Amino acid sequence: AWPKVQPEVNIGVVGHVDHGKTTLVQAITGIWTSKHSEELKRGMTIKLGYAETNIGVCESCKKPEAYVTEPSCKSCGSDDEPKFLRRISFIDAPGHEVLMATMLSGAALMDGAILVVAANEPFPQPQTREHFVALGIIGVKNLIIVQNKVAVVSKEEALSQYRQIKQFTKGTWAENVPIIPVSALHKINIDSLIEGIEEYIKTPYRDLSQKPVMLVIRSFDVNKPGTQFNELKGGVIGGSIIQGLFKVDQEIKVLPGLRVEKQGKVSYEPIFTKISSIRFGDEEFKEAKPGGLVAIGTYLDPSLTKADNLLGSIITLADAEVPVLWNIRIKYNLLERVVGAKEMLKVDPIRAKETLMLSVGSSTTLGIVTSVKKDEIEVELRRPVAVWSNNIRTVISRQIAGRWRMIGWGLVEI
Ligand SMILES: Nc1nc2c(ncn2[C@@H]2O[C@H](COP(=O)(O)OP(=O)(O)CP(=O)(O)O)[C@@H](O)[C@H]2O)c(=O)[nH]1
Ligand SMILES: [Mg+2]
Ligand code: NA
């Protein structure tokens, strides 16, 4: 039988609005990632979506069909069990331009990515570009480009767009990135995509001796309403471990922590707690490593974790030394153009006292520029940010025409 293990790798799913990211994840995993009522109602991804699957291979059968997502080789005429390869998981990002920040958050959790390009829409759409560039900037470079919805266009049209994609990636880090055509909705050529995932998105090496750091994207109260107080379960915090590993019963802290109000005056203080449980999907474990989205059960009052209250926090061991900063210095570079805009726009240089949006790990924070130089800016933040290492990538956004747009990136210097 196949072992029950945590996912060992995170694959982002990005691309322009309605190009079929969520349906693609469903075609691969059998799971629809949209869990929130507002998402199902409006017909869009809003929060980061998540889904897991095992990946195996039928060793006597021919590829790519030999690749499977369940322990069966019957589809190639074998009664033998397929060889288990690994468990993988998907970080399903929203495509809407207004939700770019959320994509950025998700990108901090990705080991690799699939860029979904609809074959029946003109390439390259604004968020195709913005997500692509974001991936490059952040360093998520194990990329597969998927042409989705090919079953509604002729082979000729698909090939025309394929040529466009090669032209686009030529001269960039993605020049030799593979392009794989599928229909997510009708489940066509999915096997080729699985094969591509095995070939192009290897599980990266993990140095488990590093200090444990988890980036937080979820937090919730798992109690049913009208639950008896003496049966109230502790708050749960969800996210991905980007380095090291966590274990049940470890003393941990959430940084920057909780918002404290003292007569209108606002500060943040670390939340200290203890790991009471560890879960990936429907399975419980004793330890949690990079790869997958983990649910950390704690002894926290559920009111503290309710409704993603802790989104953008990090979790570390209680004794870790981590700067929590209300001002940061960033060694930066700007893009030439606002790639996410419908109409072409040049990026203006950073101006003093300008308000910018900074993406750091899973966090998104507004700040005011207090110093501008050619290679460096300094920023006074509205809320503090936890900086767990030197030279963490940040992505810089500017409000253009009422919309926050990515305009550059940098390294947080401590
Ligand atoms: N014809 C066809 N339609 C598809 C395919 N994949 C998705 N769609 C359609 O596109 C629409 C949006 O699909 P969805 O998977 O939600 O796209 P999405 O990119 O996740 C939307 P968002 O950007 O808000 O997260 C749906 O009507 C869906 O049926 C496909 O392979 N072929
Ligand atoms: Mg979606
Ligand atoms: Na990564």
CA dihedral 309, 313, 315, 319 (to 10 degrees): -110
**Dist. CA 101–CA 358, nearest whole Å:** 9
What are 167's two structure tokens?
Answer: 């032209």
Which is nearest to 14 in space by CA: 91, 105, 125? 91
Report residues near ion ligand 2: CB below 5 Å.
21-22, 45
CATH number at residue 41: 3.40.50.300
Ligand 1: which of 117, 157, 185, 187 to mutate, judged by most atoms within 8 Å of the beta carbon?
185
279-301 in b/e burial notation, b at 16+ Cβ within 10 A? bbbeeebeebbbbbbbbbbbebe
The CB density around residue 244, as the number of other CB atoms within 10 Å, is: 20
**321: exposed, middle or buried (Cβ count in 10 Å: 0-12, 13-18, 19+):** exposed
Q: Which of 60, 43, 88, 83 is nearest to 194 (CA)?
A: 88
Task: Tell whether 385 and 374 lie within a shared domain.
Answer: yes
For residues 148, 152, 156, 161, the Cα torsion angle rounded to the nearest 10 degrees is -40
Q: Which of 249, 298, 246 is nearest to 273 (CA)?
A: 298
Distance CA 12, CA 26 (A): 14
Q: Which of 300, 321, 342 is the last residue in one of the domains? A: 321
- Tell the residue number behind the tokens 């072409």, with chain if given: 344
Cα separation, 211 vs 320, in Å, equals 8
Residues facing residue 359 across a β-bridge: 364, 395
HEC sequence for the chain = CCCCCCCCCEEEEECCCCCCHHHHHHHHHCCCCCCCHHHHHHCCCCCCEEEEEEEEECCCCCCCCCEECCCCCHHHCCCCCCEEEEEEEEEECCCCHHHHHHHHHHHCCCCEEEEEEECCCCCCCHHHHHHHHHHHHHCCCCEEEEEECHHHCCHHHHHHHHHHHHHHHCCCCCCCCCEEECECCCCECHHHHHHHHHHHCCCCCCCCCCCCEEEEEEEECCCCCCCCHHHCCCCEEEEEEEECCEECCCEEEEEEEEEEEECCEEEEEEEEEEEEEEEECCEEECEECCCCCEEEEECCCHHHCHHHCCCCCEEEECCCCCCEEEEEEEEEEECCECCCCCCCCECCCCCCCCEEEEEECCEEEEEEEEEECCCEEEEEEEEEEECCCCCEEEEEEEEECCEEEEEEEEEEEC
Give the C-alpha separation, 346 to 339, whole Å.
Answer: 9
CA distance 286 to 13: 29
Q: Which ligand is nearest to the CA of 11?
A: 3
Q: How many CB atoms sit inside 10 A of residue 36's CB? A: 12
Residue 260 · residue 268 · CB < 8 Å: yes
Rg of the chain taking only CA atoms, in angstroms: 22
The residue out of 206, 221, 239 marking a domain boundary is 206
Instruction: Quote the ligand 3 centre to 177 CA distance (angstroms).
Output: 17
CB 68 within 8 A of CB 75: yes
The experimental technique behind this entry is: X-ray
d(CA 287, CA 21): 30
Residue 364 structural domain = 322-414
Query: 92 near 123, Cβ under 8 Å?
Result: no
Q: Which of 14, 16, 17, 18 to mutate to test the pocket of ligand 1 (most atoms within 8 A of CB)?
A: 18
Kindly state whether residues 302 and 364 are assigned to the same domain.
Answer: no
- Residue that the structure tokens 């900063």 belong to: 325
Residue 269's CATH number = 2.40.30.10
- Answer with the one of 175, 206, 237 that is the final residue of a domain: 206
Number of domains in the chain: 3
36 and 185 together in one domain: yes
Alpha-carbon gap, residue 375 to 413, rounded angstroms: 12
Q: Are residues 75 and 163 in the same domain?
A: yes
Measured CA to CA, the distance from residue 115 to residue 304 in angstroms comes to 35
For residues 65 and 52, state if they share a domain.
yes
Angle, helices 100-107/126-138, rounded to nearest 10 degrees:
30
Q: How far apart are CA 374 and CA 330, in angstroms?
A: 11
Residues within 6 Å of ligand 1 by CB: 17-23, 44-45, 94-96, 148-149, 152, 183-185
Return phi, psi of residue 105, to 5°: -55, -50
* Integer CA distances (angstroms), 389 to 50, 78, 243, 293, in order: 27, 50, 11, 21
Nearest ligand, CA of residue 24? 1
Residue 263 makes CB contacts below 8 A (sequence gap 6+) with none
The rounded Cα 274 to chain-centroid distance in angstroms is: 25
For 12, residues 6+ apart whose C-beta sits below 8 A from its C-beta are 90, 91, 93, 106, 107, 109, 110, 112, 113, 114, 135, 140
How many CB atoms lie under 10 A from the CB of residue 8? 18
Give the residue, by CA position, lying nearest to ligand 1 atom 9.
20
Q: Which of 137, 287, 289 is nearest to 213 (CA)?
A: 289
Judgement on whether residues 153 and 217 belong to the same structural domain of the protein: no
Query: What is d(CA 256, CA 237) in angstroms, rounded to the nearest whole number?
Result: 14
Tell me if 188 sits within 8 A of 182, measured CB to CB.
yes
Count, residues in the chain: 414
**Residue at token pair 């809003």:** 46
Residues 6+ apart with CB under 8 A from 241: 212, 213, 214, 288, 289, 290, 291, 294
Mutate to test the pocket of ligand 1, among 21, 23, 33 (most ligand atoms within 8 A of CB): 23
First CA to last CA distance, the chain: 49
Structure tokens at 278: 């560890």
Instruction: Indicate which residue's Cα is closest to atom 17 of ligand 1.
Output: 20
What strands lie across the sheet with 143-148, from one edge to the other?
Answer: 67-68, 49-57, 83-92, 10-14, 112-118, 143-148, 179-181
For the CA of 361, the nearest ligand = 3
Resolution for the entry shown, Å: 2.3
Separation of CA 35 from chain center: 16
Same domain, 356 and 371: yes
Residue 36 and residue 159 share a domain: yes
Amino acid at 323: P
Nearest CA to 396 out of 406, 404, 387, 386 is that of 406
Are 275 and 230 in the same domain? yes
**Which tokens sit at 386?**
């936890």
The bound ligand whose nearest atom lies closest to the alpha carbon of 142 is 3
- Residue 249 and residue 281 share a domain: yes
Q: How far apart are CA 291 and CA 316, in angstroms?
A: 17
* Backbone φ, ψ for residue 37 (5° rounding): -60, -40
Separation of alpha carbons 196 and 142, rounded Å: 11
Same domain, 68 and 104: yes
Examine the domain organization and report whether 304 and 334 are in the same domain: no
Rounded to the nearest angstrom, the distance between the alpha carbon of 14 and the centre of ligand 2 is 9
90 CA → ligand 3 middle, Å: 13
User: CB–CB of 365/60 below 8 Å?
Assistant: no
